[PDB]
Structures are given as C-alpha cells and as structure tokens.
Design a protein around this nucleic acid. Structure first.
Ligand SMILES: [Zn+2]
Lengths: 194, 131, 170, 111, 154
RNA sequence: UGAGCCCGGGUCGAACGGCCUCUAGUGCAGAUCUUGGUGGUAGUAGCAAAU
RNA sequence: GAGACCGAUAGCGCACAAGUAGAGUGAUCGAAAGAUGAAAAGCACUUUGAAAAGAGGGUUAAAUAGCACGUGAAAUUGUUGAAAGGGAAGCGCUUGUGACCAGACUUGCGCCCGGCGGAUCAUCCGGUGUUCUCACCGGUGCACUCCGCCGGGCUCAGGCCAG
C-alpha cells in the first residue's frame, strides 16, 4: 500500500507539505533526506527508507527504516553512528545501504557531505565572530522609540540651547575666565564690563 | 566560492508593466491590467501606437523563471525550522524573512542561515550591530 | 576530489575548440615601423621587435628617440607602415627573454594604516632599464644609419584636414 | 559618600596629554562624509576607513585599538550607521604607557 | 544620503495658531499671501492701513474683478480689493505671536514672517455653505552673522 | 505574460496568515445608478424665501 | 437556548433621544446619528486676548489619543522645495539630462610539517536503554588510527563586463 498512501499524500493532503509559488514543493518531515515533496523522497510513502541526521552533540547518524517495523511508529528507525572520517563514513553508507534504490544512496551521500560542510563552515564562522566581537541585537521597539522621540522633543524645548550658551559665555566673560585683555572680545567691550 | 548555481543568463522580455487603458486619466481606474472588451477599442484591435496587451509570448525562460538577479529563488521563511529546509538547496534558494516576524526570531533566522550558507534578502531589517 | 557532489551540478560537455597559432598580417614583419592608434602612447611611431601570440606584438620606440618603453600592444590597435628598419645587431636572445609572457606581470598594523591612502607610483627597475638600453643600443645605431628616420620616429602621427585614411598608402 | 569614580577610573581622573583621535566606521561603512565631519569636530582627528574594498580583511575594534595605541593615539571613535545615517558612537580611551585601553562609552546618535 | 533642511531652533521662533475662524478662506489666504515674507512692523502697518482705508490687497489666484485703481501699481496686479475681517484676524494672530515672542525672549524689532498658512476648516452646516479657515503663522528672528577669525599656522 | 504576490521604510495598536477541502449576499468605469463627501463655474450673478 | 447569518451605507425603519426629531388639514410618511484612554489621570499654573482661539507648562506608555477624541484612504485645499509652459493637454517605443534611492561573488576548500586536546582509538573496565545488535553515559591512557584547535608552507577553485 505504498502507492495508495502516496496517492493520498500527494493528491489530497499531507501535513508535512510546504507548497511554494516558485515551482517546487518542500517536505517539512525531519526524516526526509531531501526536503522536497516527490515520490522517491517521501519518508511516509516509502516503506524502506534511509536518511542522515546530525545530533545536537555533533555526531552524525544514518537512519534506516524497513517494512517489517512499519506498524511500530516508536520503532521505525534504526540508528547507526557514522565515522568522523569522511571517506570511511561514505563506505559505511555504501555498506549499510547495499541493495537499496540508488536514489536513496545518492541522496544519503549528498546529505552527509552537506552536513560535514555545514559543520566546518559553522566552526569557521564561530571563530570569526569570536575574533571580531560583533553581535546582532534588536533595534528599539516602536513604543520605546515613540517615548524617546516625545521626551527628546520636550527636553529640546526645555533646554533653551542658544540662550544657555549665550548666558554661560557672558558668565565666563564676567568672572575673568578669559583673563586680562581677553582675545575673545573687543577692548571697548572689556572696558564696559569693568 | 559561495554564490548561486551556474544558470543560463537571465533575459527579461519586457521590464515595464502592462497598464490598464485610460488608467492614467481617471483616478477611479487602478493601473492593474484589465483586458479591453469594447468592439472599437483600438487597444483591443491592436492599432499602431497603442498599448500592447499581455501575451504568452512574453513569458520567461523556464530555467530562469522566479529567479532573482543574484540567481536564487525567493523562499519565504517565518521561523528557524523553515530556513533548515534549505540545507540541501543553499545554492538554488534565498531566505525571505516574513514581514510579521519579530526581531529576536529574525536574529535566530539570520544566524542559522549564515551557518547553512543561505543568503537572506532582508537581513538589514529591525536589527543592529553591537560591539 | 575530496567531496562527493552535494548538489546535482552538471559537468560541462567536452568542447571541440582547440588552440591554433595566430596568423599575423603580411605587413607585421620584425622591424616594421608601427603607428599606435590607442593608449597613452597614442599616435607615436614605434618599431616592432617580435610578433607574440593571440594578437599581441612586442614593440619598443627607442626611449631616447621617442618615450615608448619596451611594451606589448594588440595588432588590431596598430597601423603597419611600409618602412622596415634593419634589426641586424639587436640581440634576438634578449628579445626572446623579454618576449616570455611573465616579464610584464609584477593583515597587520601598516595594512590597516595604509587604508584610504594613495598608492605610490612605482619606480621602474635596474634590470628592465638595462634591458631597454641593450635593445635600443643597436636599434638606434641602425635607425641613425638609415637616412632621415630618427626624426620620423620622434614625431607623433596625426590627421590633418582633407586627409582620407581610406585613400592613403600607409 | 568623587572617590569611587577616581578609584574605578584612575586614567580619566597628572594632566592628560594632548589628544590624538582616530575616527573609524563600521565594517562595510558608507558614512565617509559623516565620519569625516565628526572627525573634523574634534581637533587632531584623522579618519581611516575600516575595510578598504568590499572583500578585504575585517579588523576588529580591539585590533584597531591596539594599533592606534602603538602609534600614540589617545582615543578611538567608531561611528556605526543605520540606513546610511549615523546611529551609534563608540568612544574608547586608549590611555598610555602601561595602562590598558580604558573604559568604552557607547552612545546613540539620533538626530 | 541627502539630509533635509533642518528646522530653526525653537528658541529663535514664535508660533501662533487660530482654528475654526469665521472669516472667508479666499480673502484670508490672499491677505496672508500679501504679507508673507515681510518684516513684522511692516505687516502691522499694512494691516492697520487696510483696516482703515488707505492701502490695497492684490488677488492673483482667487482673483475677482472688483476694483481697478492705481493702488495695484506697486504689486503689478490690475485687480485689487480690501478685505477687512481677515485683516483683523491676521492682526490678532500677529499680536498673539508678538506676545509669544516677548514671553519667550526674542528681540521683537527683528521679527520677520517666516511662513503663514491658511487651511480650510470644517464647513458650517446650516443650500448655503460657510467657508471658515485655520491660520498657522511662524515668526522668526533675523539671521545673525558672525565675522570669522583668521586661521592659525601649524 | 497577466489578474496578482513577496520584502524594505514610516504610521499604528490586537489580532492575523499559508496549504488541502467545504461554502457564498465573492471581484465594477458606466446603469440621466443609490448614499455620503468634495470641486470649476465663483468670491461670479445678486442683497431676492431661508440664513 | 442556539447558528458555516449581518457587522454601523450591513443587520429590523430604529446597536445611540427611534416610531424619536421632522413633514402633512388629515389618513399617513419618517430619518441621520456607535468607538478618548487601562484608569479622567478630561490639561493645574504663567501669559496673549472677548475666540467652539493661542504660546509656554503639565497628565499619560503615547496628547501628530484633548470629550472636533482608536486607525485615519481618495476626491478637494494650503505652506515649502524643484522643474516646465503660454496657437490644448494626456498616451505608446527609444536614448539623454538633473535629482533621489539601491548596492554586485553570501566571496571557499584541499593538501604538507610542528605543538596541544579529545574520541567512534584501546580486541581496557563498569553501567543504562534497546528494534538484541545497535545506540548512550562514567573512568582509564595515546602504541596505532581518526577528528578537531593553534603556528608556518603550498596548490587550486571562484561572480560580472570588455578586447
Ligand atoms: Zn510529501
């Protein structure tokens, strides 16, 4: 009944389906070896299936599903640890997925390659952000932005900037902060002050 | 080397939009295209010097349809799980964060997409750099 | 190589486009006086030493006569005249040496502090200057031996009124 | 019941020397005229861009602070942009002699 | 990027407003356009010399052929009229802005009319419709000029 | 191709969207179309009923 | 008591003063009109003046939420800035000029030494869950193997446009 569940999934409804307007559908299922909704990549409509997933520890595993455990949703997948050596992991995928469809083997090798490349890229990126020290933070929220705009308007109104500058300059002129014979003002102006 | 895929050159047969006839004169007429249905309408009869109508001959190449000038196709993302779906399609698709995604979720999406090697079109959204 | 192909990236098919030697014009002979049509030495008369490959020509307008250093130029940007100067005495070994396609080629505190500053115009060389003198020595001697030619190579070519290049005899 | 200020910041609080100011921008900064004007505010201030071209080395603020400390600069100013307009001001006091680079004050430029 | 021309300091300007005023919009707009850009005392004398009959107000956009006298020679407009009530309302708003500038601390001898805007108010529902208006004028100080000092050598 | 759709910037303040099906009071340029609002005529004709 | 109903030009004419205001001699006819804010905290006080009006100042998260009050479209209007024109304007195709805006490949991998640290390495030991042969912990050490990290060295691959 692989074909019947495929017809039900593909032509009626699937909860793992992302329909895009750009010419491709995507599979939201975590065990999909390629995140695409097509006949060969369906983890549900294929009784024998294989995928490659990476644990939060960083260890990458190969997951194999057979027809004889298909009525056992808690026992669907057997998990096999893949080696850190890339070539040895490729040969492990070749050995465990012997006599499988060539599509599943090919996509498993591609997914393992992409996961190792993403791990290397992640290490390089983490080193670069550790060296630079930059970090993205959110901007001000609209309520906080409106608050700062209104209170800055009120503070600018209450500042009286030019009057304050003129008053402080005249105050500095009175108390002799510029010294005798000030270079700032005319001699008649300094005469009037005294 | 990280870019889009090798693709055939992007050719747009027409860059302008098809405006509705007499929509520049009346404010009650939107510029969205409406096919003229009058018998003596010279736009419908295709007289010289008039508006062209949209035809299937104006269609884009199937190898470069829906493709941005960078070569990627836009993929709308609402959360981190959505950018994870582009693990195997980092060279064919670019992430477009949805307009109603908050700032912290945007930071989560941008960080993960950089690690996955997926371009983000609107990465200059409501975020800023702290030293 | 190291990685399995992680995406269905099609390899290119084998192109049947081989590389065959460029066949120059019959007027591009060694020693022919050439009129440059483009560049910063535009309009200056030089002497072709050796025809290189893919359209490139090794030319040198004796620096003493006209200020054109040992340089390369595309053949589609030169006009070949009927005057051919004798190259007897000019060392062909030196010409072959300069004719190799690598002669005209080339994060810290100072790297940061040099950002935004104008690059310095480099002085030339002590061996390239000697190379120019080595070729020019015999070339200038032959050009002086030729009647009236030294004043010809020092004058820049230009078009006057009424002169039609289609009816000329360059 | 200042004393806590001069205990916490003895370099800022025996007269300080003449200031030499280095003004820079973000990583791929586009505010060159704005940062040049902000440098022209302060006496003895030079503006140096941070990346030269698009695909060059990305120097960090700590590296630039050490570089300017080794060249006798007194303080480092970083002008960070948002929508091609100045948004943040980062003032780092490089100090001198054996004192490490001092306190960093981060302000927001709004209007 | 391009930066817009920033507003003058609020310590150097004085604003007056009048809303839902029961005067005709067209006559008030023409009167406001006549006095736009002038000095304050000149506008005071013109509005007081148009309240009592000496001086004319020209009309350019909302121009009706009513009077053709020599008083329009100085404006170059052959159509000139004398609205009265708009002059009183503009006078009241001008002394309001003068009081605002005196309270704020501005020199009232160097005040010029930076901008004066007449907008339409909601129409009075009584088919005869009244045309009230809003008036928003902003006076500023004359721009002050400071002589430079010669640059020093280094 | 198109009807349209997605994102950025501003404003705003409590709900909303995609997909598979179901359903309909489901798509406007016109009907001397209905209701509301607003114009040129026009500060014109005139000081007339109302105001 | 409910609904695959309507949501203020809809749904009863009437969500609110509704068979009310108002019209007609009368029988009868019959509207328009909802939303501040969480809370009136509904703007004290100083100062113009006769206003259903302002300027400071204050409350509030916010007053460009001020009982003209959630948001605030278009028609239409005013101020400022730029450009063009005076025997129609408007439209299609194609360059140019000015102003403004955006910012191109998201720009990488592999080898060879030296040091360090972990392991899927050790036919090392103990434990847990299992699809019973696969996973996961804890402790040992670096003879081999494999991963990373740091300091040097080298090669290669790289987007677009011209000749
Ligand atoms: Zn599917």
């Amino acid at each position: 009944s692989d074909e019947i569940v495929w017809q039900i999934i593909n032509q009626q409804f699937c909860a793992f389906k992302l329909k895009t307007t750009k010419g491709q559908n995507f599979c939201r299922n975590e065990y999909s070896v390629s995140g695409l909704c097509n006949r060969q990549s369906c983890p549900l409509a294929n009784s024998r299936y294989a995928t490659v997933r990476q644990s939060p520890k960083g260890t990458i595993y190969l997951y194999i599903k057979t027809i004889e455990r298909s009525h056992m949703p808690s026992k669907w997948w057997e998990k096999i640890k893949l080696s850190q050596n890339y070539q040895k992991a490729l040969e492990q995928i070749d050995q465990r997925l012997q006599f499988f469809p060539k599509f599943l083997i090919h996509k498993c090798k591609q997914r393992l390659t992409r996961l190792v490349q993403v791990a290397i890229r992640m290490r390089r990126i983490a080193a670069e952000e550790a060296r630079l020290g930059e970090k993205l933070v959110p901007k001000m929220a609209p309520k906080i932005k409106k608050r700062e705009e209104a209170r800055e308007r009120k503070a600018l109104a209450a500042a009286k900037l030019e009057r304050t500058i003129e008053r402080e300059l005249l105050d500095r002129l009175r108390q002799g902060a510029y010294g005798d014979q000030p270079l700032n003002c005319n001699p008649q102006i300094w005469k009037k002050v005294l | 080397m990280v870019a889009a895929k090798k693709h055939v050159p992007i050719v747009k047969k027409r860059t302008k939009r098809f405006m509705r006839h007499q929509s520049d004169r009346f404010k009650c007429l939107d510029s969205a295209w409406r096919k003229p249905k009058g018998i003596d309408n010279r736009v419908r009869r295709r007289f010289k010097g008039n508006l062209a109508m949209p035809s299937i001959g104006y269609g884009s190449n199937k190898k470069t349809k829906h493709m941005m000038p960078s070569g990627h196709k836009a993929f709308l993302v609402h959360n981190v799980k959505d950018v994870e779906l582009l693990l195997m399609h980092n060279r064919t698709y670019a992430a477009e964060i949805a307009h109603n995604v908050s700032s912290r979720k945007r930071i989560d999406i941008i960080t993960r997409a950089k690690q996955l090697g997926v371009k983000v079109t609107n990465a200059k959204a409501k975020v800023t750099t702290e030293v | 190589q190291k990685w399995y192909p992680a995406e269905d990236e099609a390899q290119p098919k084998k192109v049947r486009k081989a590389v065959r030697p460029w066949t120059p014009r019959k007027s591009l002979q060694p020693g022919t006086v050439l009129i440059l049509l483009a560049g910063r030495f535009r309009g200056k008369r030089v002497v072709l030493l050796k025809c290189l490959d893919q359209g490139v020509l090794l030319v040198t307008g004796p620096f003493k006569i006209n200020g054109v250093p040992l340089r390369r130029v595309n053949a589609r940007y030169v006009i070949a005249t009927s005057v051919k100067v004798d190259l007897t005495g000019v060392d062909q070994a030196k010409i072959d040496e300069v004719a190799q396609p690598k002669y005209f080629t080339a994060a810290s505190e100072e790297a940061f502090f040099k950002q935004g500053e104008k690059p310095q115009k480099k002085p030339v060389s002590s061996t390239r200057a000697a190379d120019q003198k080595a070729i020019d020595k015999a070339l200038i001697a032959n050009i002086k031996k030729v009647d009236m030619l030294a004043s010809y190579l020092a004058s820049s070519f230009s078009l006057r009124k009424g002169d039609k290049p289609h009816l000329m005899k360059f | 019941l200042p004393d806590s200020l001069t205990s916490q910041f003895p370099n800022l609080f025996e007269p300080p020397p003449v200031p030499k100011i280095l003004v820079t921008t973000g990583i791929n900064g586009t505010i060159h005229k704005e940062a040049e004007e902000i440098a022209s505010i302060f006496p003895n201030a030079t503006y140096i861009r941070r990346t030269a071209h698009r695909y060059a080395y990305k120097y960090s603020v700590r590296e630039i602070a050490k570089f300017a400390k080794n060249r006798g600069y007194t303080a480092l100013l970083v002008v960070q942009e948002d929508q091609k307009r100045p948004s943040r001001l980062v003032v780092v006091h490089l100090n001198g002699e054996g004192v490490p680079p001092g306190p960093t004050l981060t302000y927001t430029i709004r209007n | 990027v391009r930066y817009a021309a920033t507003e003058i300091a609020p310590t150097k300007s004085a604003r007056a407003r009048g809303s839902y005023l029961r005067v005709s919009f067209k006559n008030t707009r023409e009167t406001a356009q006549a006095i736009n850009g002038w000095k304050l005392q000149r506008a005071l004398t013109f509005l007081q010399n148009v309240i009592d009959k000496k001086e004319a107000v020209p009309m350019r956009r909302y121009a009706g052929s009513t009077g053709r006298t020599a008083q329009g020679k100085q404006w170059g407009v052959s159509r000139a009229r004398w609205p009265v009530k708009s002059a009183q309302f503009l006078i009241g708003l001008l002394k309001n802005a003068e009081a605002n500038a005196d309270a704020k601390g501005l020199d009232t001898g160097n005040l010029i009319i930076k901008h004066i805007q007449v907008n339409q108010a909601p129409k009075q529902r009584r088919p005869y419709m009244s045309n009230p208006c809003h008036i928003e004028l902003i006076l500023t100080e004359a721009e002050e000029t400071v002589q430079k000092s010669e640059a020093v050598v280094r």
